[PDB]
C-alpha cells in the first residue's frame, strides 16, 4: 500500500496517502476520528482536547474516557449529519470507511491510516508518526514506538521455536482461519508464533473450517477472535469449540485455547499506541 507522505507548507502539510491528497493544518484542533486505534494514539499523545467526534456506537471499554465526546455514529454506520455539524478540520479514517472517502472529503481533509497486512509494523509506524508530525510530537511518538519494539523483543524471547498456532475468527457459528500476512497475522508476522499451515492463502474473510480440520492440524495454540461478542450474538466461541474433536487437540489439553479481546483485535486492529502495546502483552501473557 502507498504510505502517507507529508510536506511542510508553513501553516499546513500537503499530505498524500493511498486514497488521495489533502492540505492539513498544523495542530488541527477539531478532529473527527473514525479509526479506534488512532483515537487511542491521540490519548497516548495527550491530544484528547483535539478530538471533537468519535464513533460512540462502537467505542471500546478501553476508550471510555471519550464517552462524552460528540458521537459520529459507528465505524460502519457513519452519521454524516453529525460530522458536518462539527465542522472538523480533519477527519481520520481507515479501511471500513474508504467507501465513504469522497463524501467525507467534502466535509474536511480526510486522512487514510490503513494497515498493510503484508507490512504491518511499517504501516503502524507510518500512521502514528504522521499523526504525531501534525502536532510536533514525533519525539514522544518515537519513544512510544521504541517502547513497543522493546516489548516485542521481550515477547519474542519467550515464543517457542517449534510450537504452532491456529488463528481463527468466529462469527455466528462459522469458524474462519487466518494465516501469515492476513488479518490477525501479527501473531505470526510480528511475534513469530509459527502457523499450523505457514503457506495458507486466505481471502478477506479467512478460510471456513470445521472442528475436524482443527483436530487434523492439532495445533499447540488456538488464538480466537470472537466477532459474536461485538455483535451481541447468542453463540460464543467457547461453546462453538466445546466439542469432542477440539478437546482432543494439544491446545485444548494444554489450556491454550486463547480468547483474544475482540475490541482490540477486531475493532482497533492494533492501529494505535495503546492497542498494539496491549495486544503484544496479551499474546505474551498467553504463551509464556
Ligand atoms: Zn533453537
Ligand atoms: Zn512462519
Numbering used by the authors: 23 to 310
Sentences from the paper on this structure:
The periplasmic binding protein (PBP) CeuE1 is an important component of the Fe(III) uptake system in Campylobacter jejuni, a commensal Gram-negative bacterium in the avian gut, but a common source of food poisoning in humans. CeuE, an integral part of the CeuBCDE ABC transporter of C. jejuni, is responsible for capturing Fe(III)-siderophore complexes in the periplasm for delivery to their respective inner membrane transporter. C. jejuni does not itself synthesize siderophores, but capitalizes on their secretion by other bacteria, such as E. coli. Here we report a combined solution and structural study of a series of synthetic tetradentate analogues of the enterobactin-derived bis(2, 3-dihydroxybenzoyl-L-Ser), to explore the ligand-binding promiscuity of CeuE, both wild type and with mutations of the Fe(III) binding residues H227 and Y288.
To probe the relative contributions of His227 and Tyr288 to Fe(III)-siderophore binding, site-directed mutagenesis was then used to replace the side chains of the two Fe(III)-coordinating amino acids with non-coordinating side chains of similar size. His227 was mutated to either leucine (H227L) or alanine (H227A), while Y288 was mutated to phenylalanine (Y288F). All five mutants (Y288F, H227L, H227A, H227L/Y288F, H227A/Y288F) were crystallized in their apo form, and all structures are closely similar to that of wild type CeuE. However while there is clear electron density for the Y288F mutation in its three structures, H227L and H227A are located in a flexible loop region and there is generally no electron density to confirm their presence. Mutation of the Fe(III)-coordinating tyrosine led to a drastic drop in binding affinity in both the single (Y228F) and the double mutants (H227L/Y288F and H227A/Y288F), with Kd values above 1 μM. Site-directed mutagenesis of CeuE revealed that Y288 is essential for binding, as the binding affinity observed in the fluorescence titration experiments is far weaker for all mutants containing Y228F when compared to the wild type protein. This finding is confirmed by the lack of CD signal corresponding to the Λ-configuration when Fe-5-Lic is added to these mutants. The Y228F mutants gave no signal, confirming a lack of Λ-configuration induction, which may indicate a lack of ligand binding.
